[PDB]
Structures are given as C-alpha cells and as structure tokens.
Amino acid sequence: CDKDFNAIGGDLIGDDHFGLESEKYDVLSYNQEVTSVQSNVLPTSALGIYSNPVFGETTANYVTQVALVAYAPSIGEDPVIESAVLSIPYFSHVTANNTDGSHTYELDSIYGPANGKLKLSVYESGYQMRSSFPSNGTELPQYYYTSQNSTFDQAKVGTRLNDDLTKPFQNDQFFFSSEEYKTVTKDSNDKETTTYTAPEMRLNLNSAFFQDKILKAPASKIASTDVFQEYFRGLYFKVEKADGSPSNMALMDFSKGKITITYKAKTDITTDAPETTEERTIVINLVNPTSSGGTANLLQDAKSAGYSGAISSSNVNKTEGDERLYIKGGQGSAAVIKLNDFASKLDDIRAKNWKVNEANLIFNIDSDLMTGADEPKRVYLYDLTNNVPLADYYADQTTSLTVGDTKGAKYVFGGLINLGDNKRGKTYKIRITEYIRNLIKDKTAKNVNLGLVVTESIGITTSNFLENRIVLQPNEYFSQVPRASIMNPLGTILYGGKASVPDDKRLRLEVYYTKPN
C-alpha cells in the first residue's frame, strides 16, 4: 500500500527540460453566401415556413417521386375507390402513458411557434425526374437545386388533391398535430382491436383522381417503375401562410410516406358469381430520398437586412476579414477560415523542434445580436480546398456520454454549443490538434482553406454541390457544402478575426506547445 502521492519536497527536485506554453495566432475569416445547392439526396427535408427574427423567413417546399410496392397489379373487376389517405409519420416521442391504453406524444423537430398554421397544398407533379442522364460518353448524375421551386410549381397539373373542404385542418388551416389516431375494429369475430398509430400527417386526397389514375388506368402504365413514374411523375408539396395565424416549419422523413387507396372489386368469384364485392388496397409509396434522386427540397429564404448586408459581396473583406460571421444552414452562408499567420511562422516552429500538445479555435457568439432566435446546437469545420473532413474528425472516436445521443459524438473534436447559465449560447470550440501537427511534422503538407458551417448531425459528412461554383480567389473555388448544413435551417452569428475586434472576443488560433530546452 504505497501507491499514494504527496505534495512534500517538490522544490528539491530539479526542473524539467521542456516548456509547456501556448501561442496565439490571427485568423482570416470572411463570409461567403451559399447559392442554390443540391437538395436531391437529403435524408431529412423541411416542409413549412419558419420566421427567424435575425436571419429572416424561409419557406420550404418538397417534391418527390411516387412508386408502387408491386408493379403490374391486379386491381380487379369493377373497382370502386372508397378512400385515398396519405400518411407521413412525424418525428415524435411518447411523453405520458395514459390509462385505457393510448399514449400522449410531443412533436419533435418543429421549428417556430407551436400554434402556427400553414396552408398546405398537395399537387400532382408534371415534371419528370431522373436520377442520372447520359452525356457525351459519360453517365452524369442528376441534381435538383433549392432554387428550382418555380420549375416544379409551373409544371403542376390540376388542383390540390387535399381538397376536402369539410376538414379545414388538412387544407387552408393545416397544422402539425400530435394525435394518436385511435382505431377500433370489431372484426375479431365480435371482439374489438384497439390499435394506435403514432402522430402522422393524414390527408384525404381526391377520390375521383385516384379512381382513373390507378383503379381505372391502362395496364400499360402501371406495368413497371419506368412507365409508372412517367405516368404519375410525383407529388408536389406547397406551403403558404394561413389566414391570421403564424407559421412553423418541421423536418420530416418522407421515405416512410405513402398513400393507400382503399377500394372494392368484384372478387375472384366464379363460385357464387353474384354482384358481391371484396375490399382491396393498393399502396403508392414515396421514393426514398437516399436510394433515389427524384426528391428535391425547394428552400426559399427572405434574408433580413442585417444578414443580407453582411453576406453581400460589397461588405466582405477578403484581405483583412469580417468582424461578424453569419453562418446559416440550408441555402444560407458559410465562413472561410485561413490560418495565414500560423503558416508564416511555420518555418520557425518546425526548426525549433516544438511539439503541439493541443490546438483549438474558439468561436464566440454575439449574444447581443443573436437574441430571441433559436441557436444551432453544433457547428462543423471541414476542409474547403479538398471538401473532405479534417484529420481531427477521423482521429476522434469519442461517443456521446448520454445513451442514444448520436448527435453529441466526437466531443473531443468540438463544435458543440457551450450554453451559459442564461440557457443561451456562449461559444463553440473546435480542436484541430491533428491538423496542426501534420503541418509542422510534414514539410510537403500545405495549409488548406477551412470552412465553418452549421451542422445537423456529425455523422453525415457527405457534401452537396452548388449549381454554379464560386471563385473565392484566382485559383480557389467554393463548389460544395456539407450535406448536414443544408438540412439545418438555423444559423448563428460569431465574432470575426479582424484586428478591430476586441482581443477578448476576436477569433484566433491558440496552440499549446512543448518547447524542449
């Protein structure tokens, strides 16, 4: 039992031969607006109108391709459609188990006031979508951008399918509900079957439309997916502000959405051969946004005066930098970060045999400007030159302490918000120890440009292309943006690296060295 330490006699031992100290370096950071981005393979899409006090108002639409579970179906003889219901499950969590079975749910990923209402319109798309197209000897991929709302809105056929005026909660006064949709069926020979379904978007579509579109359609149109997709191109979801009510936006997973058509046929009969009818059902599933490229998220934003002015090319200084950094998700903006000061002294750092203990970038949030608006829960830093994650991202294998919180992983890398006692954001710290180590260790390495942008999930590290690449400098381009950034509709304001910014809030790189002597 002699494994205990003590604090007696520390002055008698000689001093070591290494000096642990930290250095501060300036950073060049400017704003770069994100123009129309690719919204074709987004795992989660936004549907609604979100009003942000600082950034502004953003309207999100969605277009998708429909598919049949089993092609070349046998609808039957003399089919009569009974109902056409579209169901899209909502992100919800059970909050209170109640008696008599049933449950109480709370909607998740809903942005905006809880009492918001929007005018939802579901139209039949008349614009054929493809996942890829042959080119001059090559098979190029098909990309749908966030600014193509006009193309899909002009090529829409008929009127909105959800035209049941008897239920205003599905049209003209739509609102994301949290009901449990209790259903009871005495089909158990007399016994009931109380079945409950989680909150979902249930809409009653025009029965007449589906009668001739599927139940009374030529067999040559529903024989395969290629012919069906050309016949039923897709569904277009349009949102507008309701009469005298605020608007809210929600993030949904349309991969689980489907429209079930319930009808009655004449049955296989031949035994009784009467005018009897049987109950049949056909399901028209929505294409998967990940396995198909026939889904686009039409995001339109009305940038505020302050946000538009800061990200404007006339108010951006690429030489000195910007005092305030406005980073917003979706078709918003990003920040270009260059460690020019560190590169200038990189020659002397490697000559003195200095070792890097840790490197970090601390982004301070502008609490005064960012007041009354929802703050992003995490930020992401990547390599803008190569459009790939930094070496520190791969080197960090830490998982969130909370069980089931996959969004809080890689806490060593950083990016998570540091809220104060007021429950408001205070700063974001990202560690780039591995990136700095490689620069000093490897002489052939080059200091690449770094991009800061809001992220929804740290796991999604893919990138989405821009319709038109931006020329940052003579031979520098801004062509892609992280896919997790487009999904996040929130944004944050941070202090820049300009020399005019106070040293206590200015953005600067802090490197902790082990100076051997």
Partner: protein
C-alpha cells in the same frame, strides 16, 4: 434487322448502351389434335423509358 441507322457513333461490344427494348421468346408449340403446329412468341421483358445504361 436494321430498320433505321442512327446519325451518331456506334458502341463497342463492351460499352454501355442507353436503349429501350421489348423482348420475346420463340417456342415451338406441339401440334394439338385440333390445332396444327406453329410458332408462338411470348413477352418477358420491356423497358420503354431507359434510365441507366446497360453494360454490354
């Protein structure tokens, strides 16, 4: 049978072809008591709207 010749390049025997096709298989049917022997063509696959090129 070449009904019409295209106005472009020709693919190699190992290149990808973007085309629409309708296939049928020939099967000689046995001569029944009332029906004489003949040939029948049964449909098996068809792609009216090509989406991805097929590697030859």
């Amino acid at each position: 049978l070449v009904l019409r010749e295209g106005t472009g390049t020709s693919p190699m025997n190992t290149d990808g072809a973007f085309t629409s096709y309708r296939g049928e298989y020939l099967t000689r049917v046995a001569k029944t008591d009332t029906e004489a022997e003949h040939l029948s063509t049964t449909f098996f696959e068809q792609v009216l709207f090509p989406t991805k090129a097929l590697d030859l």
